[model samples]
Target: AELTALHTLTAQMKREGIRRLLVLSGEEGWCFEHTLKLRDALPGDWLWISPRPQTLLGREFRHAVFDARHGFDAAAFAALSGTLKAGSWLVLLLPVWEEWENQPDADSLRWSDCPDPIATPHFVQHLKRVLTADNEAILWRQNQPFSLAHFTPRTDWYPATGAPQPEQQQLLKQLMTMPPGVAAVTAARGRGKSALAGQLISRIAGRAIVTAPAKASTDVLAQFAGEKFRFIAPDALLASDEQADWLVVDEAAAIPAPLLHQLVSRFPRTLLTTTVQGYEGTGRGFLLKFCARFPHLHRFELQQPIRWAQGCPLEKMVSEALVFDDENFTHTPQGNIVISAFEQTLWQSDPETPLKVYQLLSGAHYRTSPLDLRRMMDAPGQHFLQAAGENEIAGALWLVDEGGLSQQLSQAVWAGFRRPRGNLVAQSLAAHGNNPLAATLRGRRVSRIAVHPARQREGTGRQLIAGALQYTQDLDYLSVSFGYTGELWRFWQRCGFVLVRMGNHREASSGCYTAMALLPMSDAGKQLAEREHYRLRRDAQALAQWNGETLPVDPLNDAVLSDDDWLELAGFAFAHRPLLTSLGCLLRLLQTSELALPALRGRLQKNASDAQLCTTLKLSGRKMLLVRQREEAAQALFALNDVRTERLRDRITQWQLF
Candidate 1:
């Protein structure tokens, strides 16, 4: 029965194009010898990669063997299998049946949650169970001959070399030959999506510019392009203005969504490809993020693997072990998740909690690295908390203690003289936000928050934040900053965090503005959040005039004009006052208020585009809003008898220089 199925599958794959196969052998070299049966039918230069991979007789392989005795490197396996073209095979080496279930080899530790890395790995039992029941896996027992599962091929359903039966290649090739528009090509691992991008890059005549989250991700292109091809980290590419023939951004899902948007707007010809399930990130976020940024891209998907035949058991098993797919998490354990202020030292003693913490964060945040693990282990003044479900970490929160700025140093920071370390929120408020009191009071900033991707929408993240709020007596407020996205802004807003400050510039990496949000814990914190709320809005109103061309900074804020201020603003917009009278009215009015003008001016100056001024002033568009705000300010000083009218006009010129 197994042999019939193998023949049927291979026959179907041959009809379509390329196909994959997996052999789980009971002996060390069983797979190598077994594949010899088909040696006459397949290509001569096939590969059998070992633990310390031997140089392949050829780089291209129709079928290959990977012996697990040396070790199973999931990433290396992905790379080796990725080189397979249509009609190829990838066979795996496994242990004897009795020994396979309880095996705990080195690579098993990557998926281990058995509480003891050295003990029998329970994951193998899971692997064994799945393999035993699978329809396609040819499970050769100890001293048994290799066999295949039986199957009959349907006339209409054969796999294609989908040789362009899989039609993504046609779509992509047509894209390059047609007009200069964007197309996103996506696929499961080893579908040759990255290589397809390199192929397109090779097709281009001008310099090809490309980028990814890391280097190995782009290594598939090495054979295709020499130095005419170039790779830059996402951030570095954003920092420059160089144009390219076509910007090929591989693993687009691993890069932040906003950065992807920036790239599309920057280049008319762009090819973006991402693995549907990648180690960097599952790339699901990319789909959600760009669902709205459409009409700009034609979508294509590669459903067949070029490296191995279709339905390869080893490929699926490796993916399972690595959790290469997006992790969706836990049952709603019928209670509010208890979040304990966790100590890192204690995390070691707790069974799977620490690894879960690292895993969830690494999956959710694409840029996570080993150094982050180091910081989570030993960073000063940082606190970690875990939300547990069935004794497993369902969510994790990381916080850092900030503030403790000297009053003297606060002014220096405001003046751009004293920039301190380890005080991101504090330094930003003091130096960037112009809130001197922020430096005087201590606060705890939420450095990161992660809910199991599957467990999201269960209110676990909210509960985690609620529980943490209960333990913050020593701090004035709790704060967070992140690349601003609509969903994120709304989440923090629902949790009662006020939008206090946003960066004047867009981040090169995220390609979005970063925002400051604070939930005041103390009365001082409340007052502080209250004041910055107005400043944040007021500055945001004037920011668009100077930032970038058509930047999307649509953040929600509650601090709108007070009744009297709106009435006065109506007077300025609807009717003109004599300059002498209007300026004095503004000066005497603002001077008498509780607002700190220098700090207030900094907020009014805080951060947008050119829409409001064009509407408000009927003064065309670009410079009018900045000119109106600065012109009003200049007149207010003159009315206050501060600066003379001539210098005030000249002063407004520099503000208008852009």
Candidate 2:
């Protein structure tokens, strides 16, 4: 019937002296095929526009609008809008699905009431006015199925390579067909939560939105699924829109409870994939929290591997580490071996023996002075103990009251050890830098740690760290920080202490230091530590560059400066008025294109009256300057030779001025 009507209209238009006829239809294949047939049967001099209705309309019809789908043909629409001139006629090809049924009875049809606005004769007249006079109208009820393809699912898509385990497959299939509000997949490390996610994502294709703890994890699933999946890592996933058909979160246990809550709130349909146990910790807490928050989530567990043919070593490692064998540690049966803090009475009776043990184990490099130990003993609630076998102190651990360490004791201990400056120290000192005394004394810093020399390689360090961590588990400590590095680095890493800074190696008493900190009590504490760590590295690098020397030298060396000497140098850099006045000039001169040493020296000499600038600036004297000049002349050397002086100047600016 529609074809007959189109033929009648074509014949009428021809009779009205129309040399060309425009036709518009829904399906491209059907419309083009019929138009070609009609054009072949048309009378002489009749021209038909192939593939485009706008061209056939030309100037006779005022507006040409093409409504296409299978994703809008934005390019074609844009071209029409751009090229169509005023008073030009436009023919629209409208989809059949756009027709409306119910209508009000009226002789003249409203533009909005037209079945196909683009194809309707009245709409064509409206388009003529729109293009000619810049008038515009919006027809709301076009009611078009945007794309015919969207009405049916694309059947070519399939699940990714690794299929879900039997249990997960059932749950995933149910999730797809069942209109569940929430769904969750939980398992231990090797149980294939990710594999199940891949399978589900592949099956759902474009309808599914996949997310995970990290982009790498998401990519792994996407790779298996062989589909272009939107991978949103935990941090980024929070900002995503909620209209996605479904949400999948991998390694859900690693996400903090607060963050997880925020994620779940965004989406009505959510699927969380989590491991029961892994390096991320027991997912039990996560499972419990998630279930409490999202009670409607349909829960499922996957107990088999799909990615690997068999269980991997990482799985075994995590299981063994978390689940300690009773046979390995006879003291306990299938659980962590607990050790109590050292009893004061037991230590008081044999203080010398333990002190000797500490000294020997630390290679006499520990920062705890005899006076410090005395104060530790005197302080109430100060507990010290050794986790040992029948013969000797395998590892020593100490717990001091939160407010016990005195300012004097802290300074004595910190000063005794030559601390290296780096990320660890930066974070630790930044935490303490504001209140030097409190940061030093308020929290129980691991003042001393040592594994007996004989028991060093037998995991005693780990045992000691474990004991220390266990001691602080339920305490009032904001965190625990230690000023040691090397083997201690590995041990603390296992115990969850991140190295925040490296310490100074030049301090005579202690070797290179590393500061390790546990989770801070507040964000401020974390920021302080982070800032200090950054500053320490910056300061260390600047000092190293300026001196052109490595540290930890014998203090007796002729080139080595005493602490008093360094302080004096710092003071000279701060006090010299002439030097301060000439700083900008000198810096500008140094930055010039052509280097001139003699000119710089002459300028300095002219600037100086009685006082020798070289001596004051720690540049030695005229003899050293002459030698430097000769060296520069011999080898075009124009480097910043006053780096030490510049470093001292910086130190003064940073510490003394503020």
Best-fitting candidate, scored by lDDT: 1
Worst 10 residues of 1 by lDDT: 576-585
lDDT of each: 0.58, 0.41
Using all chains and alpha carbons, the TM-scores for the candidates as numbered come to: 0.49, 0.33
**Candidate 1 lDDT, 250-285, residue by residue in tens:** 777656676777876777688877666443335343
lDDT of model 1 at position 628: 64
Residue lDDT tens for model 2, 364-392: 22221222333233323445645555543
Show where candidate 1 strays beyond 4 Å.
Answer: 1-193, 200-248, 254-271, 275-338, 548-658
Query: CA lDDT of 472 in candidate 2?
Result: 57
**Segments of candidate 2 deviating more than 4 angstroms:** 1-162, 234-237, 240-242, 280-283, 307-318, 321-432, 437-658
lDDT of 1 at 540: 48
